[PDB]
Amino acid sequence: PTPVEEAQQKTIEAITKAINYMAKRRIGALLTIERDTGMGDYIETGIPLNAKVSSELLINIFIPNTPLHDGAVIMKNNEIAAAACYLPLSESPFISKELGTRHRAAVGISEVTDSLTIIVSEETGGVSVAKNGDLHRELTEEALKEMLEAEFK
């Protein structure tokens, strides 16, 4: 592997480890990975971090009833750009009706960007991904990893 490839895999591993912990504890989480469409306008609504990715920091951000847990983490250029960011709520009538604003925010940003958003449900610990206006629900660890690898390829 090359340095860039090793860094991308390290980030994927850090994300999957954090998602796994939050799924087990049913910690709600919203993590958007910026791609070609710039999301500076949304990054600026949150608390600036520009931090190195780690599973530890991702977990610490989303602990319930803490300053940073409300809103989205947005990643950009292999860093955590900001936390507690606003994302637009989808008005799509085709999202499962049992899901709340976290999933609607993920779908909403995916309607106006090429980003990939990961959601952990606080009700079930289920893991889903929003891209292109669609929500892919009930993902296994292997399925999330495949989506992250496809996105970065």
Ligand X SMILES: O=C1CCc2ccccc2N1
Contact residues for its own copies (CB under 8 A)? 47-52, 54-57, 59-61, 63, 66-69, 80, 83-84
For residue 73, give the amino acid letter: V
Residue 137: CB minimum distance to Mg ion, A: 6
Residues that bind ligand X (CB under 6 A): 16, 19-20, 23, 25, 27, 63-65, 127, 139-141, 144
Residue 18: CB minimum distance to its own copies, A: 9
> From ligand X, its own copies, Mg ion, none, which one binds at residue 48 (CB under 5 to 8 Å depending on kind)?
its own copies
- Of 76 and 103, nearer to Mg ion (C-beta) is 103
Separation CA 135–CA 132 (nearest Å): 9
CA distances from 15 to 42, 79, 122 (A): 20, 11, 17
Is the CB of residue 89 less than 8 Å from the CB of residue 67?
no
Place of tokens 């912990």: 21
Residue 83: CB minimum distance to ligand X, A: 17
Residue 25: CB minimum distance to ligand X, A: 4
- Of 30 and 43, nearer to ligand X (C-beta) is 30
Separation CA 4–CA 116 (nearest Å): 20
Question: And the tokens for 135?
Answer: 């929500």
Question: And the tokens for 144?
Answer: 């999330």
